[PDB]
Amino acid sequence: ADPYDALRRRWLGITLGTGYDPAAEPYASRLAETGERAREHRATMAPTPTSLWPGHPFDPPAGITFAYGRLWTMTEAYVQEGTGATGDPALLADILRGLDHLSATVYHPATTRYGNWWEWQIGSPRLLMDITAALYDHLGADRVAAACAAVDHFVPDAMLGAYTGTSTGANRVDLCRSVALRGVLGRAPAKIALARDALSPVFPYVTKGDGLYADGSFVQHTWVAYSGTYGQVMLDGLGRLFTLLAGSEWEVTDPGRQLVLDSVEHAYAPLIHDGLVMDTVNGRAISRGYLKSDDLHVMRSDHFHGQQLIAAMAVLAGGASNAERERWHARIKGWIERDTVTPVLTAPQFPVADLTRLHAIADAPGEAAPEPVGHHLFAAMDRAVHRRPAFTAGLAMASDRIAHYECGNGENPRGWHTGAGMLTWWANGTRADQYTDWFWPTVDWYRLPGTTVSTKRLADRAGGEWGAPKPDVRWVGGATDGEYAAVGQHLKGLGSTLEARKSWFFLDDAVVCLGAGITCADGVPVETVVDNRNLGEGGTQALVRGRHWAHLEGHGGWIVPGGALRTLREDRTGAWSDINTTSTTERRTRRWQTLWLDHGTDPAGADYVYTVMPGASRAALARRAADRHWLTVLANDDRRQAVSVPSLGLTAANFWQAGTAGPLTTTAGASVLVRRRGRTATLRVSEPPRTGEALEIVWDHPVGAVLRADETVEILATGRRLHLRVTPGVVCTTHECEVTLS
Numbered sequence: 001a002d003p004y005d006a007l008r009r010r011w012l013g014i015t016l017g018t019g020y021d022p023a024a025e026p027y028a029s030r031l032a033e034t035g036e037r038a039r040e041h042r043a044t045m046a047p048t049p050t051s052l053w054p055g056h057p058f059d060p061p062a063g064i065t066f067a068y069g070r071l072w073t074m075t076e077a078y079v080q081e082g083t084g085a086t087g088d089p090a091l092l093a094d095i096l097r098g099l100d101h102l103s104a105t106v107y108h109p110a111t112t113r114y115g116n117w118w119e120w121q122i123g124s125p126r127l128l129m130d131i132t133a134a135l136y137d138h139l140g141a142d143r144v145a146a147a148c149a150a151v152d153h154f155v156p157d158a159m160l161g162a163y164t165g166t167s168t169g170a171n172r173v174d175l176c177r178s179v180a181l182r183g184v185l186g187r188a189p190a191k192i193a194l195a196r197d198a199l200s201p202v203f204p205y206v207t208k209g210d211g212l213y214a215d216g217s218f219v220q221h222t223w224v225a226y227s228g229t230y231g232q233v234m235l236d237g238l239g240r241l242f243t244l245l246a247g248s249e250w251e252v253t254d255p256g257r258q259l260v261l262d263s264v265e266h267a268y269a270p271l272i273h274d275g276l277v278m279d280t281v282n283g284r285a286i287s288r289g290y291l292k293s294d295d296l297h298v299m300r301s302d303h304f305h306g307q308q309l310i311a312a313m314a315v316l317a318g319g320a321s322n323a324e325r326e327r328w329h330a331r332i333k334g335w336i337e338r339d340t341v342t343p344v345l346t347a348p349q350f351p352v353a354d355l356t357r358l359h360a361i362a363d364a365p366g367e368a369a370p371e372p373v374g375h376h377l378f379a380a381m382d383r384a385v386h387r388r389p390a391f392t393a394g395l396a397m398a399s400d401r402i403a404h405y406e407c408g409n410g411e412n413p414r415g416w417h418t419g420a421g422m423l424t425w426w427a428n429g430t431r432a433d434q435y436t437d438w439f440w441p442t443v444d445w446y447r448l449p450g451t452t453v454s455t456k457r458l459a460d461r462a463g464g465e466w467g468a469p470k471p472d473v474r475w476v477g478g479a480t481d482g483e484y485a486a487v488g489q490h491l492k493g494l495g496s497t498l499e500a501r502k503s504w505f506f507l508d509d510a511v512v513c514l515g516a517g518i519t520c521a522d523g524v525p526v527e528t529v530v531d532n533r534n535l536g537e538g539g540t541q542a543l544v545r546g547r548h549w550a551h552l553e554g555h556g557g558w559i560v561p562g563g564a565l566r567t568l569r570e571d572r573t574g575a576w577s578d579i580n581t582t583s584t585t586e587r588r589t590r591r592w593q594t595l596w597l598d599h600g601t602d603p604a605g606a607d608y609v610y611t612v613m614p615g616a617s618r619a620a621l622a623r624r625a626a627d628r629h630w631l632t633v634l635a636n637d638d639r640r641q642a643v644s645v646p647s648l649g650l651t652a653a654n655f656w657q658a659g660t661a662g663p664l665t666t667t668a669g670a671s672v673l674v675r676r677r678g679r680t681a682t683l684r685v686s687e688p689p690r691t692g693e694a695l696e697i698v699w700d701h702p703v704g705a706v707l708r709a710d711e712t713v714e715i716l717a718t719g720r721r722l723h724l725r726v727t728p729g730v731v732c733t734t735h736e737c738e739v740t741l742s
């Protein structure tokens with residue numbers, strides 16, 4: 001009996017929290033508030049054949065999970081000290097009433113599942129198990145048995161068989177969560193072992209489909225870049241389950257578990273900036289904001305999502321090694337310090353158990369870590385992240401592997417161009433609320449920052465749901481040394497005949513943006529969005545313009561032909577319900593500064609060059625624009641885009657096909673980055689088309705000897721020039737070669 005009772009107790013410690021004083025803030029106010037929500041939920045519960053709370057019918061099935069969510073708040077009120085309702089028998093009776101009503105009317109084995117599978121197999125059962133676990137002694141054997149039987153009906157063993165469909169990645173972990181608890185609570189050792197075993201296929205790095213990739217990428221729904229939401233769900237359930245089972249007969253022993261720990265710093269941390277997790281990896285969730293069904297009324301946003309991912313790291317850290325835990329805690333202290341948008345330590349979505357874990361990290365000894373300066377190219381999910389002292393940026397692309405966007409369940413119907421070379425960024429050391437402050441419900445979805453698009457009007461959900469629309473292109477990726485990068489996207493526009501070559505060269509204080517082969521036949525204008533910045537409500541940040549630059553006060557600026565540049569400052573009013581059928585309808589106004597180049601109607605091989613300098617002063621921008629020397633554009637056409645930046649000793653080129661640009665030649669499409677440092681140089685090359693066919697590179701610079709080369713890099717000649725052959729692989733890995741110069 002005791003191994004099950006011990007697991008149940010350990011689950012309650014994880015779920016309800018441990019070793020805090022309920023009288024201390026902020027526990028005291030969160031518990032009081034839970035009491036209050038419980039009291040009102042109790043007062044309004046109204047069992048009917050089709051609902052348990054008015055306005056929340058069992059069809060759609062969200063209305064069932066909705067009901068379990070409220071019974072869970074009631075349960076919390078009942079079992080936690082400090083709530084004003086702890087151990088109140090009348091609260092207890094109403095919980096039991098609601099459970100019995102759900103068990104009688106909807107959540108039971110005579111129901112043939114309808115509507116969203118997720119509500120039945122993930123949303124409701126995890127809550128039902130949690131409630132059952134918290135109230136175990138008061139429930140009696142028939143209720144415990146009937147709760148286990150319902151789980152068995154909606155989540156049978158076969159749901160934890162084939163690693164496919166609705167059972168991969170975050171979904172796999174969520175299914176295991178309910179099956180494990182049903183095993184604990186129903187004293188069914190085989191269900192516990194099943195849930196532990198079924199975690200194994202989540203661990204290994206994949207090269208296609210759902211999961212974690214060796215370059216740190218994370219994919220869910222087969223084609224969607226998703227580290228921020230699904231990746232967090234996976235990380236959260238894994239940490240919960242590792243901690244649950246540790247020390248028991250069903251402890252997770254798969255050594256692949258280490259890959260999940262590794263992913264903290266390698267997959268997730270780079271996407272977190274001052275507490276937010278970047279909207280480029282948040283998929284359809286960027287459209288949620290205030291949800292109609294959320295009794296807490298907490299705005300979803302990049303900051304909400306990052307806070308949830310920080311909380312998952314805090315649970316996971318409990319089972320990490322000392323050295324890992326020490327690094328995670330230091331990064332988390334850093335995020336807690338720098339998040340002035342939504343203070344982590346009092347974040348209103350957090351129950352006391354997360355509050356306690358984060359306060360433990362806060363009070364612990366050690367210094368807060370900064371985000372390391374560097375570049376992270378998440379090539380498997382067509383994402384790049386760049387950090388410099390002056391700014392942080394996240395780029396979103398799309399390819400034959402990665403959808404333009406996801407819409408589904410009423411969410412994100414206008415996200416078409418979020419993958420069309422969207423460049424998002426924050427000025428470092430300023431408030432990081434750019435995309436948080438009612439950005440998505442007010443933005444013009446036809447003018448997303450960095451993108452090139454047809455202005456052709458599109459239908460809500462155009463291209464299809466769940467990541468269905470992908471451009472028919474291969475060359476999307478880049479090459480990086482870990483600090484700077486060349487990134488390129490062969491663009492085909494969504495719902496449009498637009499085609500373009502877009503490149504970005506991520507440097508020490510700027511991103512150089514090249515566009516070429518811009519060709520469309522839609523019969524309407526084509527635009528490249530130099531930027532589009534949310535100014536906040538009533539913003540009065542000055543826009544200053546010069547001959548070849550523009551600067552936005554508080555934000556940064558752009559070097560761009562001043563006569564070609566179009567601008568517009570305007571107020572835009574919108575609501576989350578405009579972009580999500582499940583969100584509130586309250587409307588707010590945000591002022592916008594938008595900047596764009598008009599490529600005319602039906603362009604044929606149109607182009608652009610512009611440089612963004614996030615975080616830069618007006619004067620730094622005026623200097624860089626008047627300086628002819630700092631940057632040479634080697635080539636900007638549909639066969640190759642390439643720059644030379646002598647202050648960095650840097651040459652960078654995206655070769656859309658075999659060709660030459662400045663001192664670089666390639667025999668096949670490739671991305672190449674050369675960096676000279678005194679008497680040595682390192683040459684880096686990737687193959688974004690991912691054919692895996694060998695190609696050669698020549699770099700026209702005298703070279704004495706090779707200090708080192710990856711096993712995939714064969715040296716063909718040195719002397720007057722460097723000549724390499726590279727066997728590139730099919731995941732767009734960057735291969736390197738270091739040489740002595742003559």
Ligand SMILES: CC(=O)N[C@@H]1[C@@H](O[C@@H]2OC(C(=O)O)=C[C@H](O)[C@H]2O)[C@@H](OS(=O)(=O)O)[C@@H](CO)O[C@H]1O
Pocket residue numbers: 062118123229230233285288308582
């Ligand atoms: C990852 C994701 O988008 N999942 C959808 C759910 O949202 C997650 O919900 C939960 C949870 O514990 O219920 C935790 C994650 O933070 C959320 O991102 C959810 O969608 S929604 O209602 O929040 O819009 C469900 C409910 O339908 O659908 C999932 O696909």
Ligand SMILES: [Mg+2]
Pocket residue numbers: 629630631645646647648
């Ligand atoms: Mg220079």
